[PDB]
Amino acid sequence: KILHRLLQD
């Protein structure tokens, strides 16, 4: 998910 990566970057 985009959201998964956005949350840790």
Add this chain to the structure above:
Amino acid sequence: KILHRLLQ
């Protein structure tokens, strides 16, 4: 409609 009569 039906609710009206049911409330009355």
Add this chain to the structure above:
Amino acid sequence: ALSLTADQMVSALLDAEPPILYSEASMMGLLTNLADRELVHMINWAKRVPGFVDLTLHDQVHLLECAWLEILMIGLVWRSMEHPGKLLFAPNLLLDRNQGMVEIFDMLLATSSRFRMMNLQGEEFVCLKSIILLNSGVYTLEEKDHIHRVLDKITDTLIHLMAKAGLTLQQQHQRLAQLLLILSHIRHMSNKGMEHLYSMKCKNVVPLSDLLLEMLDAH
């Protein structure tokens, strides 16, 4: 409504409680038939919620059109509290999860578990159900002020019940907030259920009563 004591508010709401009904593609028939019969009793109950009959018939229609499915689900959640993992649609219609739509089912189960863990009291439940009725359509002047004044009295009544149960002031406000936040989840479940109800109506599989069809037309 505005001159009733808190204890008088609770006794009135307890006295107004609807009865619990029985049931008899096949599952939908029982559920839609059951919802139809429960709606008829819900209307008599709404007329006994203090302050409701002060409103015009038009405003009464609007509130019930907005609130009816929320009221059906909070009642369902309430009578399922003491049956962990099940939903008691009717005393003779107790359903486990695997018997489902199911996304709605799961949310109702989670709400029942929440009620159980908070140990929701019957007196609190009837206050919550009247708040749903008065709140769910209020945002859609003098009459709106009256509904808000009745809503404030129901908040006083909830706080009164919590103080009577020995909760500290801090515990009262926390528990009040916890109860009202669950109403947001009940709104969500009703939103989802109305969408499912509309799909069902597009299909002709399931017989839906004229009252239900008029309710669905209102959304």
Add this chain to the structure above:
Amino acid sequence: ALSLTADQMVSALLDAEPPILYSEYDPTRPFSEASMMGLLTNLADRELVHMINWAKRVPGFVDLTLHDQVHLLECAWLEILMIGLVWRSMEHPGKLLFAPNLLLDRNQGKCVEGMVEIFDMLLATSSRFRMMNLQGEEFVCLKSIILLNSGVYTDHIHRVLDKITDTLIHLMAKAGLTLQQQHQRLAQLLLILSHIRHMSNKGMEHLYSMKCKNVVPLSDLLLEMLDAH
């Protein structure tokens, strides 16, 4: 998270507030359904990035696993955008300030099919907040409650939500409200959250509708937000 005082909670939430962003409004051309929708999806896209970083500054949120953080934001994101919109709009009776360069009245909302219905609900919420004289300290508390609560039913979060209730009551007492005015206003504010949930669900069905009729292309982020609901 739970070791915070009420004043420290308020300060942390105020310092975490996201900026107000501009839309890509092109005043050289008239509006269409597609171009309106393009502005709103572009705006939501850019606001979501700020919302993710705001959410990590909401006390208690970073303690969660990535999967739980994802779930909460997937449930609450449109509620969070709309409560922010309503808040921005309080000082514009009859209008919605989507952005400083996108201040719309309901006649402009009729440009998108099905939008005016949601527009009116947001307008009604904005006037409700104005009538209640909602304060920014209360607003940021409500927006944090939405983040932690909306996906909660799909112990640590409930402890944090309890601290935020304490914080709201603290704010109300400090404002001079009587004890019984305090619990009445708490209830009024939390009941509006049911209407914000309702508005989100309408907005999410409308987004799915525009996407299903190929009105505008949605970003990969918005597509996955829609998948989640």
